[PDB]
Amino acid sequence: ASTEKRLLKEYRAVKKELTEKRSPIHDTGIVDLHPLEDGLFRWSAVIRGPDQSPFEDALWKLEIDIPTNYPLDPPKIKFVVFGEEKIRQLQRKTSSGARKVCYKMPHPNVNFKTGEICLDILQQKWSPAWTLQSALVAIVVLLANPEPLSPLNIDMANLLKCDDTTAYKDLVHYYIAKYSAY
């Protein structure tokens, strides 16, 4: 019953926080966040990977599913990740409209295919104290701070176990170059 008006409040909040230039929202990495359609229980978000990190200067898209008893239960959040054939068709519409977004996510704690994320905050260290907005900031922090010992992408994680930090970074720079679009 109640959930609806929290979610609406969370939306208005972030709407108006992005409208201000000097607000701290921007250095958190959050470029955009809103509900789809008229339905409150499915949201889109765009984030910018954090500075001094291999994800710097690129955007990503996230889809957010909200359970009905939220905020008691966490949102399910995933990176939007497409197949190489779907991305190369999206690239054919090159008229440089809104923004470039990258549709692959190479990180130890995200699943390369599904876009699913392994982050304590989302898997039952969640509490109603958290908002959609701070969960996002949490995910950008995760991008700079992968956790190799809790991997959803073994191979990216193993580059860190090898201490092969340059391979990790080249590969991240690769995906961003080859697989972004509008």
Binding site: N153, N158, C162, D163, D164, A167, Y174
Partner: protein, 105 residues
């Protein structure tokens, strides 16, 4: 769309040509630790394709990079590694062939 991962040691390097990177967008090159990335790029004038080239720092990393990339074709002379009998890692990879058969694709 003709996806190939090419791993170049020092020795494999003479089978390379700047031509390959110009012509195939889905070619992706993985340098042995022995091969420095930035010297490789000026030596073949392939600065334009920096992103398609991946500097690795341990031999093990090669296999993780290959497995992460998952290219349709995987060219690598295992005989040119210093590691050996560590085929501990597997056939996750579609169509491995020794690097000598570049010219077939």
């Amino acid at each position: 769309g003709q996806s190939v991962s090419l791993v170049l040691t020092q020795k494999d390097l003479d089978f390379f040509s700047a031509a390959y990177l110009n012509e195939y967008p889905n070619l992706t090159v993985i340098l042995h630790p022995s091969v420095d990335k930035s010297e490789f790029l000026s030596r073949f004038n392939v600065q334009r394709n920096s992103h398609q080239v991946i500097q690795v720092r341990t031999e093990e990393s090669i296999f993780h990079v290959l497995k992460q990339l998952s290219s349709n074709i995987n060219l690598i002379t295992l005989g040119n590694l210093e590691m050996s009998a560590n085929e501990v890692e597997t056939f996750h990879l579609d169509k491995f062939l020794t690097n000598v058969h570049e010219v077939d694709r």
